[PDB]
Design a protein around this ligand. Structure first.
Ligand SMILES: CCCCCCCCCCCCCCCC(=O)O
Length: 133
């Protein structure tokens, strides 16, 4: 199943091309202004077959609870109301968000003890790297 070294609290240390990613998602100006200032905290936890990813930032908290492979509804930090699915591939937590026909993907991999999140919308590739506290 999902490796228990995902589990824990992560804080962002590196972000590349986040603004372009928000622009691809259609985030407005006022939200873009704030999103680039945030260095969120991500807390991954496991209760049975339910996985919970909680993102904490000064501007907004978000949380999603899900079972792998089972689709759920999600309101994103930027208030997209998506139907999303999380799957396990090759040690990669892979999330796909579906809304108004568009699609974006966030892939979370462990590398050297860090959590690297790759975010893909259209042709823009945002990479966000989290260190475990
Ligand atoms: C998530 C930062 C705080 C909230 C800022 C609101 C701007 C909307 C951002 C779009 C979704 C971001 C996806 C986060 C991926 C991750 O690093 O886990």
């Amino acid at each position: 199943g999902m490796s228990n070294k995902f589990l824990g609290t992560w804080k962002l240390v590196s972000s590349e091309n986040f603004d372009d990613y928000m622009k691809a998602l259609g985030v407005g100006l006022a939200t873009r202004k704030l999103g680039n200032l945030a260095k969120p905290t991500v807390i991954i936890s496991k209760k049975g077959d339910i996985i919970t990813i909680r993102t904490e930032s000064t501007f907004k908290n978000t949380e999603i609870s899900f079972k792998l492979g089972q689709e759920f509804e999600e309101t994103t930090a930027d208030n997209r109301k998506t139907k999303s699915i999380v799957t396990l591939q090759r040690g990669s937590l892979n999330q796909v968000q579906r809304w108004d026909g568009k699609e974006t993907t966030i892939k979370r991999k462990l590398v050297n003890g860090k959590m690297a999140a790759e975010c893909k919308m259209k042709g823009v590739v945002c990479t966000r790297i989290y260190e475990k506290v």
